[PDB]
Amino acid sequence: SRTGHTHMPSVVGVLVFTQFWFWFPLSHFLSLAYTPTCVIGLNKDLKMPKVQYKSNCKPSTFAYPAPL
Amino acid sequence: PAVDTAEQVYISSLALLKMLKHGRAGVPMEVMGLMLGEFVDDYTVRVIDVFAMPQSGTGVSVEAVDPVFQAKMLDMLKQTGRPEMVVGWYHSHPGFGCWLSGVDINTQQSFEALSERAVAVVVDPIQSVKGKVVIDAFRLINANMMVLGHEPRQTTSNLGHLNKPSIQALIHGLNRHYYSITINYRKNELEQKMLLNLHKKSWMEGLTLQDYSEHCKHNESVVKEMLELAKNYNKAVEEEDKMTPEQLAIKNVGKQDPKRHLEEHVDVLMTSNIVQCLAAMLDTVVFKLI
Amino acid sequence: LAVQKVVVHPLVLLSVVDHFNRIGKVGNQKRVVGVLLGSWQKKVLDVSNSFAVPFDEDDKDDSVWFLDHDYLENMYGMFKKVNARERIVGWYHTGPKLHKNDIAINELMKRYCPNSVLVIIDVKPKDLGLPTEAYISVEEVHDDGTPTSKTFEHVTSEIGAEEAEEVGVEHLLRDIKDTTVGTLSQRITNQVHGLKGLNSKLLDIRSYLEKVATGKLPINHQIIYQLQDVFNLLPDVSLQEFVKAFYLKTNDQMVVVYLASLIRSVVALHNLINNKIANRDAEKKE
Amino acid sequence: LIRNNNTDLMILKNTKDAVRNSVCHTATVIANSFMHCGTTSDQFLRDNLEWLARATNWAKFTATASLGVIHKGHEKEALQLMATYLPKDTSPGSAYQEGGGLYALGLIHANHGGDIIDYLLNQLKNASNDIVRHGG
Amino acid sequence: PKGYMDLMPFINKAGCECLNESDEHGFDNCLRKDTTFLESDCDEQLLITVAFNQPVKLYSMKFQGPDNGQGPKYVKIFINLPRSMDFEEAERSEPTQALELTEDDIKEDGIVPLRYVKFQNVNSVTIFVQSNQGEEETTRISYFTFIGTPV
Amino acid sequence: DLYSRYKKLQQELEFLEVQEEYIKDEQKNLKK
Ligand SMILES: [Zn+2]
Question: Where along the chain is Zn(2+) bound (chain B)?
Fold first, then answer.
């Protein structure tokens, strides 16, 4: 995890995913390992505000691949 | 209910030796026999034991299965603790790879009508070497299903595609009229220890001393051999100094290497004398009059 | 005798182990008895195939025992049809040691093969000895005046494999058989096994003599006759003639070892010369 | 994930046009669920439903289970959403689907089966087919 | 014993048939302890069947026999057998467990383990004593019971 | 940072021992 803890679903999901060698449907366990990469702003009402964070780096270095 | 590619055929240690012995003795006749065992599940076929059908006559091909021989052998095997059904048939392919011919396909269809999971095992006793037996398990692909655009089997795993099909088998109808089932071997501690007794020398041989007259003559002859090899070894050292790196090996073709033979003579002589000396020393105290 | 050596193939061992396992599964069995099939070559037997036969014995009485000899004939015709060169050469039983009724069973076996050979194949994996112990029935004519009886005479046994049979065995022993050990190490392990085998044989004699001393068994007078020859054959290694000859012979082999080691070291130096030349040449161009 | 679902459906279509085996067919289904994991967008499956119908036997089990991967975190409604995707009872080859639906239901609530366990415990108990027992 | 318990109360004691029983000592002795024993008359072999309610789980049995050699050595265990079982159907059939007892297990301070996986839902248990620790024509059993839990 | 360097070196030495022991084990099995 981001704080250094061993993410239990990520570890289990990857292992059962590697069991796709013996069972193809077991590959869906990799969805457990998928940790979303997000920054979610919240308020005292636990709602999401319209906050625009600033990334002090070039847009292209961390960006989606250009569609074909 | 399509059969799974991850299906495995388990051949016991006893079964493998019987087909190898029967197949080799029947070279080059495609000697056939029946495989006894049990369909454990949809993914496992165990071959506990096999027995060989007799050859009706001359001809290098698989003959028809003799029903009287099969039934009364199966009946009589049930008396001695073998109530195992027929899970397929085995036959030999003496040297030309493991595949199924036109006659083999017809023979397998006879088993497929009775048992839908019957397995055709082909054993190559000629191409089989120590540590690697050329074997393969086949089951027929139905023409009706594959022609319409259906795979013969479902692939839910990686297990069935670990062995790359041989070109000889692919030529003779593999993946077209029949498919290969991966073969795993069931070996236990008991049978494995029993086979370890092969070539196990008697305890008498270990303490037995070689004849000293022949041992000295062998000592004499081999040392005399190094006398000439050493003389040739000196020439080999000077020759290779003034000699181009393209002929480092081409010039060694067809001419004996004194260095290689000197090592072999040294290695042979070192084990011959050390063992004889140690055996003599051990026998000095082990067999003592006091 | 009529048999000089019995060669038992690995197929027989696997068949006997499987035979003991399958019948032993349904019911606890003291032993299982089958028929040994093989060919004859000079005076060495070549036991190569075997089949199971129905058999049962009451533990209380050795006299009560049943062997399905009609099954024995029926199964022979099966194996003769497949392999005509394999004839009945004896029988086997998995009992750890001989039984009193074995001489009786051999007579039933003797009518199919006059020189029947009983091979005791121990299913239990003994650590030192071979699992097979071949015996033949002979007439022991006693010199004490006791009437001649039928006794089993031991015949040396060896496990040998056919070329194709050996191929399968190495496939099954591929992982566990360690062939990396050199020839010199193998012979020394044979010498260690020879010491262990001799020690076990000597303890068996000592155990027998211990029981004889306390009266558990009476004096055989053939073992004691044999034992005096064994101790009489024990050489005196303290004789001056033997010691000088041993020293003379040992020094003869040492110089050959010295010569071989002397040749080995310089040949090793030649290899080091080539390695340094190859290393120096490789770095010069790069 | 749904708002920022900048998936590239051109890549998926490019490899679908190249499938000639069931192995590559089921691979795209797992691939499709991977790029749409948590995005709750089954646009690829909707458009190529007739191509998704080529999946047979355990491929249907994998294909049905891909729905749970796509709808991971959709706790708000999953019973109705799966029942929307899957009819209650079907005779021909529904064990792979019915078992796949239970497995997909587990994928939605992976590590969060607060109230889905009781349903899955009951469906597993009142199940006769082995494939459904596998998915359950 | 660790959350499980002895199960003679579950044993109905009415569907229990001990074939090869002896009139001298009956099946009641080995199910109640309080010294005494069960023994056979016709032969060393001794077939025992035990019945109870269908929900019962077996973990271990304590077939403690005497020390002279009349205690069981090789025993066969069968579960849920429709129809009756003669001595041949207990000798020519495949048991669930065929544990070969040692002298340590026979000791009254001894408990033998069973393969708990294969003993989950038991309607009745058939026990076939095939041999004893010796050649005593009668086989004796000092005490016996099943340690486990209901299903 | 002295202790971090000392412990990082300590784990590197212990890891090297693991690597050299497995490389000796593999050479034994590579000959087979
Ligand atoms: Zn053929």
Answer: 91, 93, 104
